[PDB]
Symmetry: C3
Subunit: 140 residues, 3 copies
């Protein structure tokens, strides 16, 4: 039933931390799969941490993985991501790590192992070929 592809893209994933659920789409059509923290971390205002997600992925060639902040946590507690959107290259086989930062002025954020701390989107990217010109009239 499920196994039939209705009228993929696939993303190979390794759970380096098998104790965490696989990243999942909260709903049908959702752009991102939620990434989990493998760890407990407390962020004082303005502090940042490179947080392990416990997964590694193989973004297809011609694509990019993008790590985006979750909007609820952003608003509620000022949780953001320092390098957002995080750029995961096709060639990267390492653990996805999220550079969480507390952008609240005063209140610490506690992240617990098992919390959803970001979302991962996958998009095609143009692997551009640079054409250097001395001015734009010239390139056309």
């Amino acid at each position: 039933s499920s196994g039939l592809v209705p009228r993929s893209t696939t993303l190979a994933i390794v759970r380096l931390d098998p104790g965490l659920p696989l990243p999942s789409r909260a709903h049908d059509g959702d752009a991102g799969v939620d990434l989990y923290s493998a760890e407990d971390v407390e962020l004082a205002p303005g502090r940042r941490a490179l947080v392990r997600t416990g997964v590694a992925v193989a973004v297809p060639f011609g694509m990019v993985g993008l790590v985006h902040p979750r909007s609820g946590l952003a608003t509620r507690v000022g949780l953001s991501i320092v390098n957002s959107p995080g750029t995961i290259d096709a060639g990267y086989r390492g653990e996805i790590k999220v550079a969480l930062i507390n952008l609240d002025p005063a209140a610490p954020i506690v992240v617990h192992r098992g919390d959803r701390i970001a979302q991962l989107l996958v998009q095609r990217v143009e692997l551009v070929e640079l054409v250097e010109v001395s001015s734009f009239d010239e390139a056309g």
Copy 2:
């Protein structure tokens, strides 16, 4: 004249606040349409607010809406967006709300109703099917 599609994608939009202009592209080919604030809000340094834009959209299935900061305000006054890029899912029919934050150290930002506070892009996204493997040799 206009009505002829030259050699769409369409985006259904509801102005929940009809007193605001429709989001518009500043120029031909611009990636984003500018979102307006429905409200007056003042952000002290480091403060954030979830600001109503007065619109709801229906991002097509297979796509994502992305809320990006405007570069002028970013530079001039340190206005950013906490969860940038804001991720609008295909299924979302609620009001788009922008998590504005003042990243200036010292100077408050006043946003007025009618100000352009972000930009909305629409892109295709890969709705990936996760394939869990025990290691990447295996997935190929």
Copy 3:
């Protein structure tokens, strides 16, 4: 050998500052080309600067240039980009300028001319046609 396109997209680029290397992909398949600073700038905690990259590009119509923070600098020193992801429109022929900000609480960041301070991705974008509806049942 090289010159043969194996089984482009091209991006015209002008080095307004010819003393800087052309933006390059660190590796095969990398989503972004790294942008360089044309300038020396020191950012105290919470300060931001609009930094010249010494390049101008012609993003193809139907596409967008996106300026993303580099993850290493984000983590190591709290370097981010205020309007990230920076949105470069197809029509823009000006110099790409990066709104760097120091999100570290306490330690200044020194950027040197020649340092890689961001990455530029190019993606297709949907140049959407807005269709205003009074409610979403109506648009379908």
